[PDB]
Amino acid sequence: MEENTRQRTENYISAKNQHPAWILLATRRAPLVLSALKTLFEKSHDG
Amino acid sequence: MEENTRQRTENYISAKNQHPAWILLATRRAPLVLSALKTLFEKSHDGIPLEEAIQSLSSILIEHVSQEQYDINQDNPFLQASRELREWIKRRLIVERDGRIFATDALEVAITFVESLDNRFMTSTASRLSTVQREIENLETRLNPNPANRVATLRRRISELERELQEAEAGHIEVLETHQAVEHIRDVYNLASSLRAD
Amino acid sequence: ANRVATLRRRISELERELQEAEAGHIEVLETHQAVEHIRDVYNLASSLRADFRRVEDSWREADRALRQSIIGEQYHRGDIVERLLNDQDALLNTPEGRVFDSFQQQLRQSSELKAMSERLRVILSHPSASDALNRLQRHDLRWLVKRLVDE
DNA sequence: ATATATATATATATATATATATATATATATATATATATATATATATATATATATATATAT
DNA sequence: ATATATATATATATATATATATATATATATATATATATATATATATATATATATATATAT
Numbered sequence: 014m015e016e017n018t019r020q021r022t023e024n025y026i027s028a029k030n031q032h033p034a035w036i037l038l039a040t041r042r043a044p045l046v047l048s049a050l051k052t053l054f055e056k057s058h059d060g
Numbered sequence: 061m062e063e064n065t066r067q068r069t070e071n072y073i074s075a076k077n078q079h080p081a082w083i084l085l086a087t088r089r090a091p092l093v094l095s096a097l098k099t100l101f102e103k104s105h106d107g108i109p110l111e112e113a114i115q116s117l118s119s120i121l122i123e124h125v126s127q128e129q130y131d132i133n134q135d136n137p138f139l140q141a142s143r144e145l146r147e148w149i150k151r152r153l154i155v156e157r158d159g160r161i162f163a164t165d166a167l168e169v170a171i172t173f174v175e176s177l178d179n180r181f182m183t184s185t186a187s188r189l190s191t192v193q194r195e196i197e198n199l200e201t202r203l204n205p206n207p208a209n210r211v212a213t214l215r216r217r218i219s220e221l222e223r224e225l226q227e228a229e230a231g232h233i234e235v236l237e238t239h240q241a242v243e244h245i246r247d248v249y250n251l252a253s254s255l256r257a258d
Numbered sequence: 259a260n261r262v263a264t265l266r267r268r269i270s271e272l273e274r275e276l277q278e279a280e281a282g283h284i285e286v287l288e289t290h291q292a293v294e295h296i297r298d299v300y301n302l303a304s305s306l307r308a309d310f311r312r313v314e315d316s317w318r319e320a321d322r323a324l325r326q327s328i329i330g331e332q333y334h335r336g337d338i339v340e341r342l343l344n345d346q347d348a349l350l351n352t353p354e355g356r357v358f359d360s361f362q363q364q365l366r367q368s369s370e371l372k373a374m375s376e377r378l379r380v381i382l383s384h385p386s387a388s389d390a391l392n393r394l395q396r397h398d399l400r401w402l403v404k405r406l407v408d409e
Numbered sequence: 410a411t412a413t414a415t416a417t418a419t420a421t422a423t424a425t426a427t428a429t430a431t432a433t434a435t436a437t438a439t440a441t442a443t444a445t446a447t448a449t450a451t452a453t454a455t456a457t458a459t460a461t462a463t464a465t466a467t468a469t
Numbered sequence: 470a471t472a473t474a475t476a477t478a479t480a481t482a483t484a485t486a487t488a489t490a491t492a493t494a495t496a497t498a499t500a501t502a503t504a505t506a507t508a509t510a511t512a513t514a515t516a517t518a519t520a521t522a523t524a525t526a527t528a529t
Contacts (some may be wrong), residue, residue, distance in 0.1 A: 018099045019123060025091035025125075028177045035177060038085050041442065041500080044072035052065045058398060058405070061392070088440080088502065131503085139430085146431080179355050184309040190317035192302050193374050199299055200377040202287040203384050212282040214276045218269060225265045243356060250332045414527075422519070440501075450491070460481070465478070468473075 080152050081170035091174075092130055093144075096120050097153070097163065098171050107160035112143075117141040168257055186240070187247040291387040299381070300395055303402050310409040312325060316354040320345055361406060375403040 028035050037043055075082050084090055099120055100113060108116070118141035125132045133140035145161070148154045153167045163171075176183060201213045227233060236244060278284060287295060290326060324345055328338055349355050364371050382396040391399075398405075 014103070018095075018120070021098070022092060022095040022124065022127065024178050025095050025174055029091045032099070032177050035085065035174070038082065039090075042155065044076045045069060048065075048069040048072050055394065056061070061394075143431090182309040182312055182357070184357060185303040185353065186273060186356045186359075188302070189361060189364065192299070192306075193279045193370060195302065196374055196377045196381070197293075197297055199287070199295060200381055202295075203292055203381065203386065207279060207282055207284045211276070211279045214272050214279055218272045218276065221265055221269050223273065225262070225269065228262045228265055243353065412527100412529080415525085416523090417524075420519105420521075422517100424517080425515085427512105429510100429512075431508105433508085434506090436503105436505080438501100438503080440499100442497100442499080443472075444495105444497075446493105446495080448491105448493080450489100451491105452487105452489080454485100454487075456484085458481105458483075459493075461501100462477105462479085464475105466473100466475080469471085 081163065081173070084151070084153065084167070084170050085173065088131055092124060092127070092169060093148070094171060094174055096124075096144075097148070097167060098175075101163045107162045110156060110159050110161055113161050114138070114141050114145055115118070117145060139250035165257060181246065183250060185243040185247040185250065187244040191251075261357040275406065289386060292384070293390045296381060296387060300391060300399050303399055306402070306406065307409070309354075310361075310406065313354045313358050314409070316349065365407075371403050375400070378403070383387045 030036075032043070037046065040046075067127060076086070077083075087093075096117065100108060100116060115138075118138045121133065121141055121144070122137050123138075124130075136214065145154070150159075152164055153170075154161050155164055156162065201210065204210060206211075224233075275284075324342060327333065327341055333341070350359055378400050382391075382400055387396055
């Protein structure tokens, strides 16, 4: 299981650098953007 | 509903400034800390005795000295582990009682976030849909206040199980397909895991 | 024999309940309890959508890999046919593929999906639903069955 | 033998000093976001050239 | 009467210019994390005084 431990920090290093959601949560202006986006898609589901 | 829209940015402004998990995800050094903490609490559920926890942490951090891109303790890894445990207690990530440290629910949510990110076994599974089907059946039969509706529901269900009993007395019963059992059981595990966090 | 005994105890349960119902003593879910009971139902469904969204990306990337490989000159016609067949067989066997395949099998057995949608329609009509969820969530859950078909 | 006073020894508490570790505050370096500027791309204004269908004149 | 060639009008496409907006790149200000230094707090070393239990001698 320790091999998963050693390899895991690579996964989290990559995601913190790459995956959209985590990058969004990281950025300073995250709350405004997230609230606005939630507001938009909330009131309709068809796109 | 627009009032909730106006008020909501206050909620998210507060959380981004205050709540532990979000602050942790924000910090530059988030991934190392999250991986180490997950490693610690993963292998035991009783809350680690503080000495054991700090020793295991000083062991884990040594593995990441190869990760030169973030802080490496040049002379005393044990001091580093103790300092990090102090710090994470300061951030309310870990609260310790009776000498046994525990992972605050905030850190539980934080780790549950990054876990669901990568290409993974997703929160859902194939059996999820059958689960919700059965649950909707049960809930509908419950909410139905008309008694004849319950009568008919009972009649159809008893007919179903009576057919199944006729089969079983003949020995034709069928098991869950072995491969299907894998994700079927993983689904059941996923369901109950929530109870702990709440 | 374990299935036999399970069936026997369960038929005893429903036989007791039928004896009660023929007398008219049936009991409803306590009105307040039905609120969180329905909300749990909604909470379960939310996952299905957010992983069909992941299935979308999985198939998109599989298709893009197929294209980028089809550029490969050395690929004989048989090689490209084999790559399509294998990339789809393997893709269907990942957890994404298992979820998608099970949902597809529901389509063959359509009557169950239709029954689920009908029951959902009956559920959100009850007064408890008004308290349980805002109208947006009632709108979504009722057309979850269709929404899976769309995705 | 009982009860009180003194000395003895043992145990513990306390006092001061040294060293080590933690915590708080300030300074510095680094990363992130914003803004400025340049250049390029999209659209639209104006007008010209070209292309198509029609109609008229000429030839069979 | 029909078919072929030329002139006409209409429609369209195209060319060039102006302004607007997008995108890319550079510089700036700012926030975050780290590190340095000070002071403070915790522990332990060394020794002294105090406190308790005991025994021994004295007085009744």
